[PDB]
Amino acid sequence: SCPTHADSLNNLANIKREQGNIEEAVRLYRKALEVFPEFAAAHSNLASVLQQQGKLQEALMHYKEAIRISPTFADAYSNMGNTLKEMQDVQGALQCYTRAIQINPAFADAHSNLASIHKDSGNIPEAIASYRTALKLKPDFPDAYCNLAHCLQIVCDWTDYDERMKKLVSIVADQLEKNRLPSVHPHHSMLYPLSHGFRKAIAERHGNLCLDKINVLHKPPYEHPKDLKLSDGRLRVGYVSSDFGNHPTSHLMQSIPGMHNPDKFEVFCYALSPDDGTNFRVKVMAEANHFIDLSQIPCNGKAADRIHQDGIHILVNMNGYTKGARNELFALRPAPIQAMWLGYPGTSGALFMDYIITDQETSPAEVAEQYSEKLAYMPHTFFIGDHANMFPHLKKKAVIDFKHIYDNRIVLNGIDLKAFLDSLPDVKIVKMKCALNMPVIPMNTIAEAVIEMINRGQIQITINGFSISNGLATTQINNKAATGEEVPRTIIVTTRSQYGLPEDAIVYCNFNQLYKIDPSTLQMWANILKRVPNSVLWLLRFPAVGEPNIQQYAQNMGLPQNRIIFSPVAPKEEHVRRGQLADVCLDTPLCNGHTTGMDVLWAGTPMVTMPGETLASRVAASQLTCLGCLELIAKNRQEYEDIAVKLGTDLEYLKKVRGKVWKQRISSPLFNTKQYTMELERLYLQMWEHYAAGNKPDHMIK
């Protein structure tokens, strides 16, 4: 019955949590609650560690209790909220946060938590509002400050940018030393000027967050195979992803499982997400030797066992710290070898991950410092894309003449393009020198009927019985094709006039999310635009609220509205296809276009880059050197501007480079998934031979 006894028990548990010894802390709290059952603070503390243990089920019940005892406990409401969120019950969580703020208007944390819900839903201005509220209520609040910082980044509010940055670094630096969990998310750490030392250290900590959740399960280490004997001479590779579906990851690697060689490899795909019923999911299920739906084995314990029973040699993590990740699986070390691949563009910083598949250009030897894993190099680039298979209609184009002869003002693509062109009277064939060429339809009645459709905004027309489609309406003609799930079965016209682009101008584009732009990147582009008098920059409303903001910072650098053009975001296929309309693509040096990189390159649109120091800023370079276009890679800001300007001012040079990209996307290794798969296989075998000979993981540079 004694609260004085119970009280000191609580103090003693609070001490075990300081020393990190969690399992003892729990025992004490439980006694404290057995001595005095109506003890608010204990229920609350016990709850907040059970939450840490991933025992959300029970943790919630104790929070409820604390609230029942002591109903003015705004702090418990807020934390109960966090618990509901993690249980996928957003509504319930939200009700808590609001309920708390009502009880204590002046309580900072609940406002911050509320803003975080808003962020997850994509409600950014609403998120900003609430973060700002929280920081007014409590001006030293790292979590809120950093989250705010990321929103501002997301919409390109660069108010006080340099201060902001200095203060972030300063906050992390403190939290790292003070030994707490840093407020900056690892996946974001790449956007700010932290030391590589810091980036790694942040990742470390999130790695450890896993270990806590698995010590609760008390599992013995697993027994890994030492030979390929039970697996019948075949090496067993498991791909683990929450993204077998309509997601970038699948748009890159969906062909790979199918292309593995069955004599030497047995392929297991472990889905962490439910079936969205898209073809991406269908294809992988149909081609992998074994498809396993782990989205229905939510206990990380049984899931790990399952992998271990399947007898996997190499387990590949395609998530890192993205949404859907379940790194607890990897932390349980069910495979002898575990590598990061493709999905997450940074180090995991964690002990349980052995290798990271990358390349010479992305991760040269000197910067080994910044990864916790050991480097495993692919021969060219570690990047890959399914464009060859997804969008073969863009393997060839044709143009309509209206005037000079331009490769990108009115464009036609289609599987049956050749057949249609032969139905036409007067088709001139422009040679592309140094087997290749681009047909040109002259301005007869037919061409006019096509512009007619475009200008009037109609869906489609018929010409000599061929089906001709408006590029903007693909989605209504055939939704599966618009998404990339099918190859289109009609001919598709794509024009600059559709997007309100000047017919007679140099078009620089960037199709990435706006968060990747910073004030230097923009300055740099302003520079280019000024020096290339009759040109525009083409950007996306990604998200839309970022547009007014960029327009502002552009006006401050002396650019009329006219000079930057924003299009809405488009379905995958349209997005890829309309890159054909640009002249050059300027790549964000803070954090490169990754998928976006492949997407412009597939369109045959040269892309200029300046490789930084983080992996995320070095990818476009890597893609380009693999393509074989070393003259599009700048060493510094000055040089980048020069390359861009030369391309805009020298129409002969442009045509040469454009033409060189158009050829090499086929001939280089870059979009060749078969060859890619094979190199990946060679690499796997090296990793295994090494482990089989009884060695610990170490760098692999051929």
Partner: peptide, 11 residues
């Protein structure tokens, strides 16, 4: 239509 981006984890 809508987009499918890489989204970050929860912290």
């Amino acid at each position: 239509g809508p987009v499918f981006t890489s989204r970050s984890a929860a912290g």
